[PDB]
Amino acid sequence: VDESYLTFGVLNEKQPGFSWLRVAYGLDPSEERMRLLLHSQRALRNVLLDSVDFSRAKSVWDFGCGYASDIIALGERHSHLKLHGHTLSSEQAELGLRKIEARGLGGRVQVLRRDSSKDAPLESAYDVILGFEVATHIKEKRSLFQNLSSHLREGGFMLLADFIANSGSSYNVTPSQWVELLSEHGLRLVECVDVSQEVANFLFDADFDANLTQLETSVGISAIEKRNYQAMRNFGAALERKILSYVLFIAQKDSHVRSTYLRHINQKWVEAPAPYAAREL
Amino acid sequence: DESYLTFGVLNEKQPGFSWLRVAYGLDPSEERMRLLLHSQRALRNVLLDSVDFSRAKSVWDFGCGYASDIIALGERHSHLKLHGHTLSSEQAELGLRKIEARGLGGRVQVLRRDSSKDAPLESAYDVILGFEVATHIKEKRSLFQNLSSHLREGGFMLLADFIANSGSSYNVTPSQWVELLSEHGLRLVECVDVSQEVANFLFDADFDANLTQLETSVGISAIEKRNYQAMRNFGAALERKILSYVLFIAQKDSHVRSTYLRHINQKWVEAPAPYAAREL
Numbered sequence: 040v041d042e043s044y045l046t047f048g049v050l051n052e053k054q055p056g057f058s059w060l061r062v063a064y065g066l067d068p069s070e071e072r073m074r075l076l077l078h079s080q081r082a083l084r085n086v087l088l089d090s091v092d093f094s095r096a097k098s099v100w101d102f103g104c105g106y107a108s109d110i111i112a113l114g115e116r117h118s119h120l121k122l123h124g125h126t127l128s129s130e131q132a133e134l135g136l137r138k139i140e141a142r143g144l145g146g147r148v149q150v151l152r153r154d155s156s157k158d159a160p161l162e163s164a165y166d167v168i169l170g171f172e173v174a175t176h177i178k179e180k181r182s183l184f185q186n187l188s189s190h191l192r193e194g195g196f197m198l199l200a201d202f203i204a205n206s207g208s209s210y211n212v213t214p215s216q217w218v219e220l221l222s223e224h225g226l227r228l229v230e231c232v233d234v235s236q237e238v239a240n241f242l243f244d245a246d247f248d249a250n251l252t253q254l255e256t257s258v259g260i261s262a263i264e265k266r267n268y269q270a271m272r273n274f275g276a277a278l279e280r281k282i283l284s285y286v287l288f289i290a291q292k293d294s295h296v297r298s299t300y301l302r303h304i305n306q307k308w309v310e311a312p313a314p315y316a317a318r319e320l
Numbered sequence: 321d322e323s324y325l326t327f328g329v330l331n332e333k334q335p336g337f338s339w340l341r342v343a344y345g346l347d348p349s350e351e352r353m354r355l356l357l358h359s360q361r362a363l364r365n366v367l368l369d370s371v372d373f374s375r376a377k378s379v380w381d382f383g384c385g386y387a388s389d390i391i392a393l394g395e396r397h398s399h400l401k402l403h404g405h406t407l408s409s410e411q412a413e414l415g416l417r418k419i420e421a422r423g424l425g426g427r428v429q430v431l432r433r434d435s436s437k438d439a440p441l442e443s444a445y446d447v448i449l450g451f452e453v454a455t456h457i458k459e460k461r462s463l464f465q466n467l468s469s470h471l472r473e474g475g476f477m478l479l480a481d482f483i484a485n486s487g488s489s490y491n492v493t494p495s496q497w498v499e500l501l502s503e504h505g506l507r508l509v510e511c512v513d514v515s516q517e518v519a520n521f522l523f524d525a526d527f528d529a530n531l532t533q534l535e536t537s538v539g540i541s542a543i544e545k546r547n548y549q550a551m552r553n554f555g556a557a558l559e560r561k562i563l564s565y566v567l568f569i570a571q572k573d574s575h576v577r578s579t580y581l582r583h584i585n586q587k588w589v590e591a592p593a594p595y596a597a598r599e600l
């Protein structure tokens with residue numbers, strides 16, 4: 040199944056009997072729940088992507104692109120965009136480019152095996168940088184943000200979805216560390232959107248352990264898929280207990296704001312993010 | 321002198337403080353003079369502290385009064401070109417003479433130009449200042465067209481001005497502020513609500529008696545007298561929440577999606593940072 044089916048989504052309330060695993064893998068045949076799965080995932084992505092006028096962008100860098108679903112989708116939407124993805128695995132890189140060529144996106148959309156904490160991307164600067172749950176999988180976050188910010192056009196967007204570690208316990212990063220990573224690299228938050236409870240809702244499955252075994256024995260999954268799914272369940276429990284938050288960061292490269300003020304406005308958004316529920320709907 | 325007559329922010333009302341008595345030295349208290357000046361600087365610095373002026377080349381103050389603000393910025397940052405617009409000739413002459421006394425000539429200029437219509441000197445500025453100017457201008461869409469088109473991409477627009485709430489200078493509702501900014505590609509970084517703190521600064525239970533004492537002791541112009549009465553009335557309106565007084569920190573942004581730009585401008589106009597909660 041496509042990797043986009045296995046990403047987080049936002050649910051406004053828990054849906055009794057909804058299992059993200061069963062639905063994604065079609066063990067639950069309901070076309071209505073399949074629609075809800077996809078809608079919840081697009082709704083999460085669109086909080087970030089809807090901020091950017093892509094008609095004024097030339098290039099996008101997804102610095103941990105998985106199987107390149109996100110940049111393939113953007114590429115089919117916006118025929119003029121160069122989109123470049125980075126991944127650490129050769130499997131994802133080969134499978135991504137096979138998808139890219141199957142859709143005829145070979146000129147504009149590329150996937151490279153490059154370590155975004157160290158390796159420069161293809162362009163000297165990008166108009167948009169995407170990182171959906173990438174940064175907290177990277178140990179050397181300062182080197183990463185040095186690399187991202189130096190390849191972000193002035194006024195360009197950095198769109199992140201990632202975890203914040205609260206008074207509690209993957210490399211998890213506290214609010215101050217997020218403020219310092221953004222502020223010291225000239226990245227100014229336009230908005231932070233807190234989707235913690237809605238992602239917890241999406242991930243909630245009272246039958247997770249039994250559904251995972253049914254997936255193992257019926258469909259067959261890899262050791263790495265199984266462990267990722269167990270980690271996702273655990274993330275949902277952490278979000279419910281508010282040990283972690285899951286936050287959508289809309290930031291821009293800004294070399295002209297004063298550093299003391301930049302810290303202030305980044306603190307405002309990390310510490311008082313817009314709650315997803317109050318924000319729209 | 322003219323800086324002394326601007327709004328300031330007071331965190332609480334101060335019994336016996338009269339902004340008029342203090343500004344004109346009828347109240348001789350040295351401590352109250354320093355409070356007046358501190359309150360006025362604190363209001364201005366909420367806006368000015370957002371900008372790294374070392375990375376700016378040029379500033380446009382589109383209603384500069386007697387040019388006190390751009391003169392002060394010019395003496396702080398020796399490399400800046402600063403251009404002021406005013407509608408009045410005595411304004412421009414007095415400003416230009418004050419600029420020349422400081423040796424700021426050439427670098428700091430004041431022109432008699434109508435900012436709602438007339439282009440400024442530079443094709444684009446890094447910072448645009450407007451402290452209580454926009455609501456004195458009738459043709460606001462023309463004005464914001466003129467300001468935005470002469471604002472460098474990513475440059476700052478720093479405004480201090482009123483918002484008309486359910487209630488009654490041309491006063492502009494929250495939706496009109498959102499539309500003026502959004503339709504001209506101006507994105508709010510922050511709005512700071514200083515309504516009650518400016519109300520505190522303006523509060524003078526003896527205003528009418530103090531104004532007469534000013535008229536009869538010092539002597540003031542018809543223009544000044546009316547301005548001071550209007551300031552007292554603004555304070556009363558702010559106390560009643562008929563108007564708000566808000567500090568807008570905005571930037572030119574051609575790359576944000578228009579629907580999202582309206583959303584984030586609404587966020588800040590409708591839920592500005594309260595000055596009291598904002599710093600400690």
Ligand SMILES: Nc1ncnc2c1ncn2[C@@H]1O[C@H](CSCC[C@H](N)C(=O)O)[C@@H](O)[C@H]1O
Nearest residue numbers: 103104105125126127128153154155156171
């Ligand atoms: N240091 C690093 N440099 C480049 N890519 C990295 C990286 N660390 C992790 N990644 C990549 O980032 C991804 C982290 S999980 C994110 C998957 C992707 N966002 C999706 O929706 O499918 C993985 O694909 C991994 O290959």
Ligand SMILES: Nc1ncnc2c1ncn2[C@@H]1O[C@H](CSCC[C@H](N)C(=O)O)[C@@H](O)[C@H]1O
Nearest residue numbers: 382383384385405406407433434435436451
């Ligand atoms: N349409 C217009 N174009 C240029 N200047 C204008 C204007 N309308 C008003 N002004 C100027 O804006 C000022 C209005 S109030 C003065 C604000 C001043 N910056 C201060 O706080 O001290 C006056 O100086 C007036 O000359």
